[model samples]
Target: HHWGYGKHNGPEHWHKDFPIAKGERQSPVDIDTHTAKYDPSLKPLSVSYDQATSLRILNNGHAFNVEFDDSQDKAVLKGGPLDGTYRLIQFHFHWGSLDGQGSEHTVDKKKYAAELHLVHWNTKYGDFGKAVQQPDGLAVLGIFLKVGSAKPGLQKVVDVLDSIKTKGKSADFTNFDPRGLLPESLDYWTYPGSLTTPPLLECVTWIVLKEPISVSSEQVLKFRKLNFNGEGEPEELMVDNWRPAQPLKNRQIKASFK
Candidate 1:
């Protein structure tokens, strides 16, 4: 029933079956670090490290949820439609090979090779299933990983790719400390938008940092090494699992401490 946009065509040719596609919030944006305005409102509400977060390796054959324990690192949404405290639910990555760039969100109509999303939801909304339907129930921290110098921030994640390189499987990262993963500049662009996925929920407050973390070419290839197959006897390789960019329907993206 729902048609998807691929790398070649993208949302420029997406169908009306996606009415929200016509909505005011979409992603895959380019951020010029120089154009940002400083706003204290952009700082992360709060974060907790050392919590033994839960990891759920779904049997459904999709990416695993490297969930976090928000009880300690709970976050609060300020000045957004869904005003309430939220918790870190899970985090995931989207990547392409060294040869082929892979990133879902683009900037100024350009697509980056790879991106990472730290997914969170307002605890007031109950859970991911319920919060996803409400606009303003979700807050996503979007991080861009570009090929270049090696960044210590990325080392935490890239080092552990081996644990979940296989599809339908994930491992807990007790040593994982998310704080190191953020860009040097917390300055970011903010906007109201919907998930770029199916049923595309419209209630998300997106925070896209201006600084792109550095990642080595080899580190990116690690993500490309991912392989997946159904849990059943016969398994298939799950390559090219990334999604295309969405439309930006006249929405003005505001930055915090830009």
Candidate 2:
């Protein structure tokens, strides 16, 4: 079977098709606060986005993503354990069937309602595909989402879900910026990791925020209405679209805050 979040084809069975699944630096590892080291050397994250660059919102049978115009360095990420600027390529989310168990990376064994990932690629590599082959080619910023009062910034994205009801569905998305999605604090934990989903390359420098953004339960529910199955196929709701935590092994997680 092809890779998916289903019981038989989910993360556990991905290794057969993508051997990198078991490689060092596999992502979405459980975050154990007891071992998160405070490193004074890490830099605060710097990000500036171009509101006009956001192009569309689409569902790709895995997750819904806000695609960006990456032809230029309009939206970029720097600092926070990085040596150069990484251009923002896209942003997406991983959610679960219910509120308590969606997040891929749990903190102190705690799971959140959902998690968001902002993916960027080093400019030197020119594009995402080529960058993934280099050790320092990509950086992903992860933000945990807790259920609370509705997050004003998130509504804009969720509001568009109705147009993308199934895989391969998409709609024009513009005049928006992701800066508002960020937590007030730029404090984070940095480590060497890979994409939580397939092709699971070990080239990413992960910057997971220490703070979480809040969203309404209803906002999250709207995404669950999305179907992993495309039109004319047997239907399956898209939920629990997160990988379970992978092993940390000999890797070290360093924090920007003490």
lDDT of 2 by residue, 1-258 (tens): 779999899999999999999987898888888899999988788887853399999999999999899888799999889999999989999998999989989999899999999999999998999999999999999999999889898889999998998999999999768987999999999889998889888999999998999999899999889999998898899999999999998899999997
lDDT by residue (tens digit), candidate 1, 7-74: 44335444355566566565544444354444555444344434535544332243445666555544
**Among all windows of ten consecutive residues in candidate 1, which has the lowest summed lDDT?**
73-82
Model 1 alpha-carbon miss at residue 89, Å: 0.6
- Against the true structure, whose TM-score is highest? 2
Per-prediction TM-score = 0.75, 0.98
Q: Which ranges of candidate 2 are over 4 A from the true structure?
A: 50-52
Quote the lDDT for 2 in model 1. Answer: 30
